[PDB]
């Protein structure tokens, strides 16, 4: 990875050491950025659900994981499981549970620093990763994103500034999650969100991290050329609400 300072760079050392798991999956996989394709050619509104008990950002919710995500089955496009151990509570037997029990795409939210964490999200289920561009060198990106697609996962590039941008589309991504949060310090910037959304090839699959606010910002957006949108603390808080936010 490269050189990192504070919550960041203990989470990525604390993810270099993560024990690898041993599973024989039970499903082929399902391409998430397929799915979210054929929501946008249906014009049903897509959204990534994703279950994170707790993060740096304050959020801090317990509620079963199962019932949640057989809740969200009938109205997300996928799922995101965070599995990050010490500033989300993630667990892999978590992720475990819940893919098996739904039969929709599933993220396996963490910080992917090294091959068996690969592994790991295949072995465990799940049908993607992220890939952090901010966290990974270029030839981490390039590499971790090759061992990926040899399992038949196309993975999210996640980006935050023009220059992530430019080394994801250097390396080749078709799957790119633009994020409003700096990973480093927390701070939201929608601006610069939009800005580097206007920048992306019309041929890539693009999901915003949204939040404050939503509705509003979904058609606005989608306009942009957003495919699918990605949630987190407004639905542990309220499940429910992802129905208004697909319906009128």
């Known amino acids: ?48 659900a994703t279950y994170m008990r707790k993060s740096p950002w304050g959020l801090d919710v317990e509620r079963d994981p199962i019932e949640y995500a057989k809740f969200m089955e009938r109205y997300a496009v996928g799922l995101s499981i965070c599995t990050e151990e010490k500033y989300a509570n993630g667990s892999y037997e978590t992720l475990r549970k819940i893919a098996s029990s739904v039969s929709i795409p599933i993220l396996m939210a963490d910080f992917i620093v090294k ?10 289920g799940a049908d993607t990763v992220p890939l952090i561009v901010k966290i990974l060198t270029e030839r981490e990106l390039e590499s971790l ?21 430019d080394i994801a589309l250097r390396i080749g991504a078709r799957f790119i999650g633009i994020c409003s949060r700096d990973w480093e310090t927390l701070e939201i910037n929608k601006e610069n969100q939009r800005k580097l959304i206007s920048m992306i090839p019309s041929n890539v699959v693009k999901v915003a991290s949204t939040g404050i606010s939503e509705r509003n910002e ?9 495919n699918a949108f990605s949630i987190i603390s407004s639905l542990m808080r309220n499940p429910e609400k992802i129905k208004e936010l697909i319906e009128g």
């Open 145 to 165: 994103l090759e061992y990926a697609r040899s399992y038949g996962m196309e993975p999210i590039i996640k980006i935050n500034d023009e220059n992530d941008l």
């Open 115 to 124: 091959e068996s964490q690969i592994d790991d999200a295949y072995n465990l």
């Open 218 to 226: 979904i058609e606005e957006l989608r306009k942009l050329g957003v």
């Open 1 to 48: 990875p490269r050189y990192l300072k504070g919550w960041l760079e203990d989470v990525v050392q604390l993810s270099l050491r993560r024990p690898s798991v041993r599973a024989s999956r039970q499903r082929p996989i399902i391409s998430l950025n397929e799915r979210i394709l054929e929501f946008n050619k249906r014009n049903i509104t897509a959204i990534i």
